[PDB]
From TrEMBL, chains B, F, G, H:
Biological process (GO), any one: proteolysis
Name of the protein: Proteasome activator protein PA26
GO cellular component labels: proteasome activator complex
Entry superkingdom: Eukaryota
Record SUPFAM superfamilies: Proteasome activator
Proteasome activator PA28 C-terminal domain span: 62-122
Native species: Trypanosoma brucei
Length: 249, 230, 243, 245, 241, 230, 230, 230
């Protein structure tokens, strides 16, 4: 071991902050998760693993709604993600919706979140988050989007990608079967066949949590009368909608 | 530096992971059964000498059965030491740029390298000129040499001088103990092969486990990944 | 053993600040970026480092940024450390505009930034910025100007500079062909005519670039600032020496 | 070997070495000497300049605290400037509140209650400054209650009153000599040649009115710092008596 | 060892961290201050070694603090820029609270005040700068020249130098500068400043900056030619003997 | 100090990086194949002695074929040890001013220097007087000397002759084991050359890798760069 | 203490830096060429013995050409060891007051002193009574002594022992190997001089560099400068 | 404890600083010139033996001039070792109460004591039974003893030796090398005195400096001074 990897404030002789990479290790360990950008949609999915079937997994989400046009998932330290989430849904109001009378575009939320991710770094006395998220959404002027966010605070945009244990290859599979055209149903497909090899458990409707960004749901509002207020694009598929698409391979 | 890159490349292509893995498989089946074989070969050979009575007759010839074991043993050590040097050559050429950071894998490399050298020391044996740890190592792979040299010295004492096998002008010493010692030198060197091989089993089984677990880190000591910088 | 490189708050017996030097070492791990002065404009050329088959890159950017409507910068080093600065660098730039109701002069902006980087080098509990910057802009004080700044907090003005990987090479080639008056379309030429030579990839592919320039004249009595699009690149790239 | 690295750490035998080393910092200063007489008090110091281009008066080793109190320091100069500053404010303030002159020891007192402000951690109050000051003081003054007094301030936080005392590199031999010279019936002019004599002795370089500064304070004219011509002839007038006996 | 922190005394009463800071001043280029009896002259050297860069806005090492005071340094470049700024502001605040513009010692004192403040508490590092402050107090005609170190102490000099090879230049000065009678001409006072750097400049006047300051807020930098007009006249009598 | 600068300059011009790199290329091709050659040269020479029967006749002459190997070996060690000293001379003269800082490169220098000395120790061999680590090193480069000395002592015991009566009979000392020992001394010293060369391959291959990676730091231990100070 | 100051003064005036610098210049030119000379002198002397056939005739006289080399070598070692002690005397007397601070220079002194002693150990050679590191050092400067002692023992087994009466003899040994060993003892001790000198070149070149760099600190270990205190 | 105070007092009065300072002055003048004298005394004695031809005549008598040097040397070592023990006795009795603090001076005492013991080790020499560091020390102060023992063994081989009726000879000797070895034993032991004295100069000059600097701390390891407590 070095003598430089135990301080966020410390540069190794080459120029690599340390604690960050080990934090980034807890991520390269977490359960496999992916995201695919379509042409008329975007899909984000991640697997589920049960400590024991005595536990109700249907009371702990892994694909979360930040804004009714953006959802996100992760791979790494469970607990971080849970609150990193609620802090994201707020920095989304106090920092945009409450100043501009509207919700934020994809790009800026991801950056408002990487901003909170940044703090964890620059400062001894705290540890960075052991999580890496894939945030997917869509806003009028930018079409659909796909982004990754690491403890290092940096963030990038993909067309498709995966993070987690079974990523080296899953990220290899996708590379092969992706092209600018895939409609959403195709993506939803290509995803399962990739969330396929990346498992040792099973493939039911519970151990799989997948949601997607697509068309507006004039049903999922709760009211009707205002023309422009049309609906949320984020849809977390239900246990059922799933296994049906599993039968048709 | 396009040529310097070449040299290092050809080096690691000559000794791939496949080369060393083959060595482990051999040790898993073939080489281990052989050692267990040499084990009882000298085990029963030690039982024979225990139920024999030594006379002047046995000082006039070297027991060919024993020379058959110490030889069969020296042969096995020879092979192992070479098969080890193979595994070592596979790692030594994959030790990265000397740094003061990111040596988590390097540590694993040096660790395994040490256990391997500990193995090579056993097989190579003690010798006759010595390493600060002494000769707590059973018997070297030069058993044949040491054996003949030990027995030879006693065959001259028991065994007289001017003359020729019989009753003669040419006698020897009467020490009843010196005769029993010729009997023990045959018994001991047979026991030393039992032990040397029992321990050698353990050592080999260990290295196999140690290799099969850390092999990934042995080939890839460092995993480059600059996701932060850009 | 025992070394004096454990932090920024410590001078080695010889007055060296290692921690700062190591940060200065983090730069040689970044994608090459160039800046060339011209009799009528300034050119900014960079070479995306990060790569993968499925990596969106036609929309978002990573090395070239607009700070002011008359000033631009080339990044090299820690991604996150770069944004923290870039943003404040933008706020300061607007306060000057809001106070003097005039646009902020280049050197002033470069100096303000270098002065923050300086500070993270003198106070405990702080880690210096692992960034380097090539500032290219124009003000009515000194026409076009090219500036550079490192993590140590020092800055300087070049006529043609490079930072990042293989700076030795890139720096050398320039030092050679740069004609002191050289027009713009010759700098954009020399941009690739250098970036090319110092790359690795079997071939220099457009999707692996970022260009931007600053021009002005009698016409628009002011400055026009352009950030080339994937298109213009893949094109001007062929017009030179790529099939 | 292990207990001398914390200013708030007792050694097994109840000692605070960092404080002790603090003092050891003073020995490095050049010598300062104070002699008290029923006529007034005298302060003299060895200047010791590295170069002939320095401006002598640049080295303020003897300074005024107030019209009735002066002093000479030894040790770290930056650390001195801070005490001299506090001391001066202390005097002036007291004046403001009482319309009178601060007792020499009551001033000296406030100077020590300042050094007493070292230590970092937070066990209650708050006194911001990490370690002990690296300097001592020779405070010569005079007040209506106890007349001509002379004090020694140490970073330890304590102080004693002296009849004569010396600090700095030479306080070793200087203090010995003074032990065998000082006597209650010394005239002012007598002490001047004595302070002047002991420096020359345990000093080093040829004693010229450039590497030696001399001052004094009296009820009549307060603190005055002897100009070069005076000290110069006080040296000749001195070095002369050495011929005979 | 005891040289690890600013808040620890070595057994012999030292504080090495501050001392080491000084070792950095020696790293920087050479600066030299020389006063006359109606003026003061500062001189420096240009790190002209790796150039293919601009020229226009190149630092002169010498900076004005007020209309009547200039300051020069040696050591950590970036560190120096803050002291120069802080001293500039203070110089203007003094006029705001006392009408009267600052005195050369009051400024030097303020600067060294700062330098010392950065060696107090830990979690702070001493400026790696050493500086020369020259000028003339308001409505006064006595030339002044002070120097400050990273430790916090300040001093006045008839002539002085800091930076790499300052030991040499100093020797020279010492056996040339007459305490009893300072250069009585701005021209000769320059001549003397130049010839001194001409022992570490490594030939050429392309490596020498000269700034002259006289009374009444009258300050003025020097040009490349003028400076060479002396390298010229001193390269004569050099082999002339 | 313009002359002191000269001396140090001429020194480093006499032994440039090119000098040491040439040594590595030689070891890459030529020198390695040679070792692999001496490997089997004594391998088959050991097989021959295993299928032979020793009589008084073989004690009256020294096997020229074996002297051919131990000689060919001593020759190779000689060369390597000299080619190593070349690489060492290239570094030793480039060890910077002794400081308590900026020794990241210096560490690399000392590190490689150590591995090189470990190589020189193997080739130089054990000897007959020794180092606290003993003689776990196969056989020195003085094999020839040690060999003749070992065989010589046995050729005197085995050998001491004269003539008597019509049919022929002989008169050296008896021990049937002493005769077999003369056979083993020829067999062992042939095995010791196999091993010594197998390990010597590994060692050389290691040093090649170790050099090709850290060479930059070996020549430029410190990279001056004062960007902060000015 | 005005007298105590004197003693220390005269000491350092007897051995100034000029004294040790002279030693370095000598090693730079003269002494190095001489070693390179003794190198090939014994190189060709080793080639001669390789192309010769030894008979009883060569056991009745000691080859004067070889005694010429081992002597010429012993001479060089002698000089170096004395020229080293000069450099050491220059430093040892300049080691400052023992303190627990300001030892940055002192470290340099001790460091160089160590490399010098490592040099003196090589020249002084091994000997015959040993230091925990053994005798990995080629040959001492007492080669002459060890050589004659080695050959002498073999010249007795060879030329013999002959006691008389005219009716029976003794021997002029038979072992054919004992004769070849007399040939090897002449060949080896010539090789040992090649190596010993090759390494001795490296060592000397190193010390020259090491000295020319740190010399300032060697003479001035501490640089007094009290600018803070006053 | 008024009596316990007495004992310690008388001890330090018997061996004051004056006692040890005298020893240093002696070494400064007298003792150093003597060593430089013994240096060339054996230097020219070594030159003589180099230009001489040895015959049976020189084996029948011991060269008295050599015995004159080895004796004159043994005498000097004797004195030094005693004068050292004086300086040591001066310090050992002034080592303060064992504490875990205020050992800045104590460290100096132990330091100097170590350098002194290193000196005593050189003079006392190697011997013939050995300390883990070996015998890298030139020659002990028992040179006379070792010399006669070395030459004696060879004078029995060259000369022979007798008894009566048959032939006076008895023991005794071709080997042309054994004769040259008698010549070398006289040459070597003369060289060993050159070196031993050269190094002994250095060592003495070092201890003088080391003493003259730290002497204050050697006598006063701790300086009581309770100014804080009261």
């Amino acid at each position: 071991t070095d003598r430089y990897s135990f301080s966020l404030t410390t540069f190794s002789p080459s120029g690599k902050l340390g604690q960050i990479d080990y934090a980034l290790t807890a991520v390269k360990q977490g359960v496999t998760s992916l995201g695919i950008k379509a042409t008329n949609g975007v899909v984000i999915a991640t697997e589920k693993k049960s400590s024991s079937p005595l536990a109700m997994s249907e009371t702990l989400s892994k694909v979360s709604l930040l804004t009714p046009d953006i959802g996100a998932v992760y791979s790494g330290m469970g607990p971080d993600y849970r609150v990193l989430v609620d802090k994201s849904r707020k920095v989304a109001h106090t920092s945009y919706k409450r100043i501009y009378g509207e919700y934020p575009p994809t790009k800026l939320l991801v950056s408002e979140v990487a901003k909170i991710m940044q703090e964890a770094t620059q400062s001894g006395g705290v540890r960075p988050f052991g999580v890496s998220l894939l945030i997917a959404g869509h806003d009028e002027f930018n079409g659909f989007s796909l982004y990754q966010v690491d403890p290092s605070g940096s963030y990038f945009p993909w067309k498709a990608t995966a993070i987690g244990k079974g990523s080296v290859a899953a990220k290899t599979f996708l590379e092969k079967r992706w092209n600018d055209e895939l409609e959403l149903e195709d993506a939803i497909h290509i995803a399962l066949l990739t969330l396929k090899e990346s498992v040792e458990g099973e493939f039911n409707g519970d151990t799989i949590e997948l949601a997607i960004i697509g068309d507006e749901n004039p049903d999922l509002l709760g009211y009707t009368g205002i023309p422009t207020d049309k609906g949320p694009r984020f849809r977390k598929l239900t246990s059922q909608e799933i296994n049906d698409r599993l039968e048709a391979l | 530096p396009p040529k310097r890159a070449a040299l290092i490349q050809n080096l690691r292509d000559s000794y791939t992971e496949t080369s060393s893995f083959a060595v482990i498989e051999e040790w898993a089946a073939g080489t281990l059964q052989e050692i267990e074989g040499i084990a009882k070969a000298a085990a029963e050979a030690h039982g024979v000498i225990r139920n024999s009575t030594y006379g002047r007759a046995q000082a006039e010839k070297s027991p060919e059965q024993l020379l058959g074991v110490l030889q069969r043993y020296q042969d096995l050590c020879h092979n192992v030491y070479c098969q080890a040097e193979t595994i070592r050559t596979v790692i030594a050429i994959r030790i990265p740029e000397h740094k003061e950071e990111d040596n988590l894998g390097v540590a694993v490399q040096h660790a395994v390298l040490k256990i391997i050298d500990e193995l090579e020391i056993k097989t190579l044996g003690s010798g006759e000129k010595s390493g600060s740890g002494g000769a707590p190592t059973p018997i070297g792979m030069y058993a044949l040499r040491e054996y003949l040299s030990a027995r030879s010295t006693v065959e001259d004492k028991l065994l007289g001088v001017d003359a020729e096998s019989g009753k003669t002008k040419g006698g020897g010493s009467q020490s009843p103990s010196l005769l029993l010692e010729l009997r023990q030198i045959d018994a001991d060197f047979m026991l030393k092969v039992e032990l040397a091989t029992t321990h050698l089993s353990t050592m080999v089984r260990a290295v196999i486990n140690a290799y099969l677990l850390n092999w990934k880190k042995l080939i890839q000591p460092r995993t480059g990944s600059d996701h932060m910088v850009s | 053993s025992r070394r004096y490189d454990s932090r920024t708050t410590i001078f080695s017996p010889e007055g060296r600040l290692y921690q700062v030097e190591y940060a200065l070492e983090s730069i040689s791990h970044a994608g090459t970026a160039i800046g060339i002065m011209a009799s009528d404009g300034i050119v900014l050329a960079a070479e995306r480092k990060v790569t993968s088959t499925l990596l969106e890159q036609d929309t978002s950017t990573e090395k070239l940024y607009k700070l002011n409507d008359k000033i631009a910068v080339a990044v090299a080093g820690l991604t996150a450390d770069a944004e923290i600065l870039i943003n404040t660098a933008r706020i300061h730039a607007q306060n000057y505009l809001k106070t003097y109701n005039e646009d902020i002069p280049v050197e002033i902006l470069v100096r303000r930034l270098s002065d923050i980087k300086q500070g993270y080098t003198q106070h405990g509990g702080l880690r210096p910025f692992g960034v380097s910057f090539i500032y290219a802009g124009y003000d009515d004080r000194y026409g076009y100007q090219l500036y550079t700044s490192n993590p140590s907090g020092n800055y300087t003005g070049w006529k043609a500079i490079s930072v990042g990987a293989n700076t030795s090479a890139a720096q050398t080639l320039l030092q050679m062909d740069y004609k002191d008056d050289m027009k713009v379309d010759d700098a954009i030429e020399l941009a690739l005519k250098t970036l090319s030579k110092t790359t690795d990839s079997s071939a220099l592919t457009y999707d692996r670039l970022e260009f931007a320039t600053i021009r002005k004249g009698a016409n628009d009595g002011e400055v026009y600032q352009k950030i080339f699009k994937p298109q213009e690149i893949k094109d001007i790239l062929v017009k030179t020496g790529i099939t | 070997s292990e207990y001398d690295r914390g200013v708030s750490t007792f050694s097994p035998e109840g000692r605070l070495f960092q404080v002790e080393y603090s003092l050891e910092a003073i020995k490095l200063g050049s010598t300062a000497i104070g002699i008290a007489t029923k006529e007034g008090v005298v302060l003299g110091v060895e200047k010791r300049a590295t170069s002939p281009l320095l401006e002598s008066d640049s080295i303020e080793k003897i300074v005024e605290i107030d019209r009735h109190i002066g002093c000479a320091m030894s040790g770290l100069t930056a650390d001195a400037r801070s005490m001299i500053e506090h001391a001066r404010t202390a005097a002036v303030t007291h004046n403001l509140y009482y319309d009178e002159d601060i007792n020499v020891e009551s001033l000296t007192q406030s100077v020590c209650d300042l050094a007493l402000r070292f230590g970092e951690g937070a066990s209650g109050e708050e006194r911001l400054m990490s370690r002990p000051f690296g300097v001592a003081l020779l405070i010569a003054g005079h007040d209506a209650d106890d007349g001509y007094q002379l004090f020694h301030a140490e970073p330890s936080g304590t102080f004693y009153r002296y009849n004569a005392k010396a600090i700095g590199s030479g306080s070793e031999g200087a203090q010995a000599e003074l032990l065998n010279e000082w006597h209650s019936s010394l005239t002012l002019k007598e002490a001047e040649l004595l302070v002047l004599k002991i420096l020359k002795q345990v000093m080093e370089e040829k004693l010229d009115e450039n590497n030696a500064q001399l001052s004094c304070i009296t009820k009549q004219d307060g603190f005055k710092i002897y100009d070069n011509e005076k000290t110069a002839e006080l040296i000749k007038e001195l070095k002369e008596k050495e011929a005979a006996e | 060892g005891y040289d690890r922190a600013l808040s620890i005394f070595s057994p012999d009463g030292h504080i090495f961290q501050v001392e080491y800071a000084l070792e950095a001043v020696k790293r920087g280029t050479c600066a030299v201050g020389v006063k006359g009896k109606n003026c003061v002259v500062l001189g420096c050297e240009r790190r002209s070694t790796l150039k293919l860069q601009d020229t226009r806005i190149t630092p002169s090492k010498v900076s004005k603090i007020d209309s009547h005071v200039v300051l020069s340094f040696s050591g950590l470049n970036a560190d120096s820029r803050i002291l120069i700024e802080k001293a500039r502001v203070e110089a203007q605040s003094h006029r705001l609270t006392l009408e009267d513009p600052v005195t050369v010692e009051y400024l030097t004192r303020y600067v060294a005040g700062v330098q010392q403040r950065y060696t107090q508490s830990g979690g702070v590092r001493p400026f790696g700068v050493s500086t020369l402050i020259a000028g003339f107090d308001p409505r006064d005609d006595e030339p002044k020249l002070y120097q400050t170190e990273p430790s916090g102490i300040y001093s006045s000099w008839s002539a002085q130098t800091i930076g790499r090879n300052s030991k040499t230049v100093r020797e020279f000065l010492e056996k040339n500068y007459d305490r009893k009678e300072p250069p009585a001409t701005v021209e000769e006072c320059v001549k003397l400043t130049v010839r001194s750097l001409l022992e570490v400049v490594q030939t050429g006047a392309k490596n020498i900056e000269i700034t002259v300051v006289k009374p009444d807020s009258d300050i003025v930098a020097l040009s490349s030619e003028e400076i060479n007009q002396y390298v010229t006249q001193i390269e004569q009598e050099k082999q002339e003997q």
